[PDB]
């Protein structure tokens, strides 16, 4: 029935994504040398000018609370509605 076609579609999307991640047609594993300034330039900017823009010697807890702070606010709102939903439907009948 239907689920045979579902598994065939799963095999097609698996093979296509396996084509995508290959270094001959697509993305590259283990970048280094010249490609660090062509594919990861924004991260090079966050490493270089990171100390004296914000303060705080860490980097991952620097771009998650200062540059991209609005996403952490959205994340906290997600967890708040998770707790409100997981308590509100577990009440007695």
């Amino acid at each position: 029935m239907k689920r045979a076609l579902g598994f065939l579609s799963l095999l097609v999307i698996f093979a296509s994504l396996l084509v995508a991640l290959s270094p001959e047609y697509g993305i590259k594993f283990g970048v280094g040398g010249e490609d660090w300034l062509k594919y990861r330039y924004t991260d090079n900017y966050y490493i270089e000018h990171g100390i004296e823009e914000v303060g705080g010697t860490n980097i991952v807890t620097d771009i998650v609370f200062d540059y991209r702070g609005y996403d952490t606010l959205g994340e906290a709102t997600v967890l708040f509605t998770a707790i409100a939903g997981a308590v509100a439907l577990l009440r007695p009948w």
Binding site: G55, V60, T61, F65, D66, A82, I83, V87
Partner: protein, 145 residues
């Protein structure tokens, strides 16, 4: 509702988890850790308390209201330090570009602009959230209807 040895080792271990979970949350500028990572650890301490002692000893030591008003009060502080520099842009970090107190040299405590306040806010939110989520499951009603 466990034996004897497990209960006394809960007595020894719960402050050992608690003070370390405050150590991670306080030093979020320097070492790995920060908001959520220290949020889960104190919740692990709460799980060890709720298991080693039981439902009876935990029911009249956890009230619903105080673990529900602090889930919100720990969020406002996240917007508390997010409206300070509103005369320039939405965040803009006015404790650093001349703020009074959190303005020291960038190696130690008290360093960055408003990061310790946000780490305290997120940790206080996550601990109360996970504990009040698990306690309401452990009571639920009964195995049968």
């Amino acid at each position: 509702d466990m034996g004897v040895i497990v209960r006394t080792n809960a007595r020894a271990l719960i402050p050992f988890i608690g003070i370390f979970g405050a150590y991670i949350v306080t030093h979020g500028h320097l070492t790995p850790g920060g908001g959520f990572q220290g949020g889960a650890t104190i919740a692990g301490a709460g799980v060890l308390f709720l298991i080693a002692f039981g439902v009876k000893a935990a029911k009249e030591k956890i009230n619903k209201n105080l673990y529900s008003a602090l889930e919100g009060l720990g969020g406002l502080v996240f917007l508390g330090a997010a409206m300070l520099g509103l005369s320039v842009a939405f965040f803009y970090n006015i404790l650093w570009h001349e703020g009074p107190i959190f303005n020291s040299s960038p190696g130690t405590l008290l360093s960055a602009g408003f990061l310790p306040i946000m780490n305290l806010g997120v940790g206080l939110k996550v601990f109360t959230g996970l504990v009040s989520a698990l306690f309401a499951l452990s009571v639920f009603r009964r195995w049968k209807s």
